Design a protein around this ligand. Sequence first.
Ligand SMILES: O=c1ccn([C@@H]2O[C@H](COP(=O)(O)OP(=O)(O)O)[C@@H](O)[C@H]2O)c(=O)[nH]1
Ligand SMILES: O=P(O)(O)OC[C@H]1O[C@H](O)[C@H](O)[C@@H](O)[C@@H]1O
Ligand SMILES: OC[C@H]1O[C@H](O)[C@H](O)[C@@H](O)[C@@H]1O
Lengths: 638, 121, 242
Amino acid sequence: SRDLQNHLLFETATEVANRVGGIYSVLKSKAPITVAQYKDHYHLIGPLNKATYQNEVDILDWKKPEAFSDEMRPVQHALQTMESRGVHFVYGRWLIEGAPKVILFDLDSVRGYSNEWKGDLWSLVGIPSPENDFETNDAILLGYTVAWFLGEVAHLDSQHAIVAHFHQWLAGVALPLCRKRRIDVVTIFTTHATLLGRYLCASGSFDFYNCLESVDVDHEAGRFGIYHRYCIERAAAHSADVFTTVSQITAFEAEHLLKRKPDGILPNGLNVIKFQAFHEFQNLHALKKEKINDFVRGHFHGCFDFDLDNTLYFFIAGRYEYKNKGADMFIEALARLNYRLKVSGSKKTVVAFIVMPAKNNSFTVEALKGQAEVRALENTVHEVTTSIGKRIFDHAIRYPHNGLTTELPTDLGELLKSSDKVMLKRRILALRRPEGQLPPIVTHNMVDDANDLILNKIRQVQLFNSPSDRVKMIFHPEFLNANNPILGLDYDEFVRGCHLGVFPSYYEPWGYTPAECTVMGVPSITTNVSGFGSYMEDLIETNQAKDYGIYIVDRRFKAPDESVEQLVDYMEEFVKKTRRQRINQRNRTERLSDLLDWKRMGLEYVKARQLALRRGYPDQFRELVGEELNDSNMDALA
Amino acid sequence: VSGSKKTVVAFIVMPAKNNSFTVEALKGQAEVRALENTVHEVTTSIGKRIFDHAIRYPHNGLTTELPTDLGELLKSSDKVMLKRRILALRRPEGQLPPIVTHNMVDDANDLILNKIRQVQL
Amino acid sequence: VSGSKKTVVAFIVMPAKNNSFTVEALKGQAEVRALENTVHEVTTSIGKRIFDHAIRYPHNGLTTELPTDLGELLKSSDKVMLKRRILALRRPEGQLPPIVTHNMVDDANDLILNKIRQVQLFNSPSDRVKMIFHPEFLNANNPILGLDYDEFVRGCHLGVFPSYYEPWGYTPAECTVMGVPSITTNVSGFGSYMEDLIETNQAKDYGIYIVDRRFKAPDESVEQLVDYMEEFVKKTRRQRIN
Ligand SMILES: O=c1ccn([C@@H]2O[C@H](COP(=O)(O)OP(=O)(O)O)[C@@H](O)[C@H]2O)c(=O)[nH]1
Ligand SMILES: O=P(O)(O)OC[C@H]1O[C@H](O)[C@H](O)[C@@H](O)[C@@H]1O
Ligand SMILES: OC[C@H]1O[C@H](O)[C@H](O)[C@@H](O)[C@@H]1O
């Protein structure tokens, strides 16, 4: 007789205590909505990071009677039973919006059981475990600790149904354990990628999306030295009451590589902070864009022959994954767009930015002299307009006396003196660049310039930023930061200033980059093999979606060359827009950002847990609803 | 030896073969420039708040003519960006302000740098 | 009565015979302007001091990134001049912000001024509605309020034009075009025209408040008018923006 309505939720992940990847940001942004639903029935569980946990967690005395409510007692008693057997942990408040409750286990305090637990797991599930793989060691240590902790809560809490939700294989070991030991909790597993997915796509030669149905998983996992890891992912997918992925595209991948068709998808939400005035973001775009204009003026000093009032900023940003993030298509397409723009005789310019970290030796001398010379021009101009102001003023205050017959000066000579001209001329000379020197394709000195994938592609297609190129190309091999001496914007600030994000992903389980972009109200190009793109694709009819600034390139059903051409089409369609059209588009794409808020995507998590309880206690569940609903899906339940 | 609190900055301006300014030289000037602008933004805010106090006193609970407490004027948001600017100015442990502003074509053979190294300034 | 914390400053812009702005009005602006410049001086000094601290950290005993004490930044010299400017703004005990910006020709028999006196809105602290009569049309050269009429309207929140005779009324129509909500009556050309295009409930949301001066006794009308104003004051910024 367990309460399905008043239930507990434990959410388990490697990244709870600490930031490794994006998952840390998912559980962080997801917290406010979760705590709103559960309050003190919710606990996140992860391994303790001894180095950092004190910056992020608010340590709490869990022994205190007041630390838990009457109905939460079992959790306290469960921790005491863990403490009883020498298992050290930290219970506290994760210092983030929502302030969820945390249980972090000290894996050193349980490392003793390593030999036995490894032996056990091998016997139960068939999972081998090489000693030099520190991560699966920790994955295992965690798994037995969590199933242990869960088993004990199940013992002492007769009131609530318990939901246990695990993220990624590194947090999946408890799953086969809960199944086999038949612990009275319902379980959910979310995968945010698949191990074989990443690896089969690493080299860039393999035709992933048309061939994965015919891969021998065991053979491949052995080929990559990944067999043990893969076993953990598979056992977690098979053991869980509910199996989920972050996206339809990974769900496809998952069915074939983990041999189980997901029960649904849990797409990543963001915690969107609205402005008091809807148009505020529109003002921010203009401020931020002026900062970029500034950067551009300096970068093109001595070669500035285009109109910024008619210049669009494209960007790609993210980790340096040349094939997987589609940097190759981005550059390829830009080169073809350059051609189309010249043939049509348009006066517009695209300045294309690539923001991807590469080994480098900091900014070039050129980058910094240029900024400084432009600054020096600004300051001189300012001195001069003070002078001009003094002369305009005298004239205006003097009229019509002492010969002044016109109210205003009519001769520039009256306002602009020769000493003024000399210093302006000197500043202009400072900006001149030597004959034949084009603005660089890069802001940094690179460690391995000759072998760099991105730079080689730019050089191969020959986008050298010459006067007649309508598409300019700037590689910035480092993450943006308002401390950057040449382009002093934080990443988010930069995105707001740009016009179009271009993210032609080939392997991308989610798509934080275009989502985040969408949230800043900036249109973007994605692909249908990106999680975000595939999500969007299901939500809006593909022609409609261009109007909300989502452009989706088909990389799944189209030859690579046909994909590049579609990308050029989109970019070209965008450049043809007028300012009015751009503005109104950004408005539409700003309204779309609602659909990426947790207030909406959190409903999916609700669907998943509702499915888990439905599956685990079907008798009691029907008894709540009124009749028997379908349980072969998350969707077929609601 | 005499415990003087004075400092002498000695400049040598003599043309020698070089490859123009160092990255270090240009980066330092840029970072200092960035601190200046941030300080200017903040003092605008500070002005807004001094001015409000001045025009409001003695109403709405104001008991002193001027602010007495910094927190009235300097907000979390302001403190964050100045801290960040200060971090940009920080140099790696044990790194010293250079004895030269340019990259030299032949730094080891240059007579001036040889002397400065020899006397260990 | 409702204990609201909002404040309405109401302006009346209507030409009446006058001898130009009072001395008080001009001194007022000049005094405020002089405070502004002294505040700008002080913050430049503050700037030098914040900057020095920031560039020196953590040398010479500067153990924290920022100054923590106001006295590292605000010097006594600064304090003296700020106080002198604060004293210049001090008005003698009991004296209240004026209800008028000009010296009137016939102050005693002016209709606007007499009504304000009769209803006793004298701009006292406890009054939540403040009143400023400005008996001249607006012009950007006006030394006191350097705005052109169109600009002033843009700056405002609500135009209120409860005409009883108004063949049209550009006054409320101009508000509309400039995105400022307005109150007119159903006996104005403009009001009945809008009445015809939008159903009265919807009309309030599109910033068109229409007071019924045709089928209600004048006192009922005045009340409807107060309802509108109160309902408006109840709005949040977000609501006003929308
Ligand atoms: O200059 C930058 C560029 C990117 N990012 C962030 O780094 C992440 C990079 O995403 P990644 O490529 O690792 O994953 P994906 O974008 O494919 O989801 C994004 O969420 C950005 O917010 C950043 O912080 N600074
Ligand atoms: O950068 P664009 O697409 O040309 O848009 C530029 C526009 O951005 C925002 O809407 C600003 O508020 C406008 O004042 C500006 O005209
Ligand atoms: O038509 C312009 C104007 O004509 C008259 O001056 C009316 O009094 C006024 O209400 C109308 O707007």
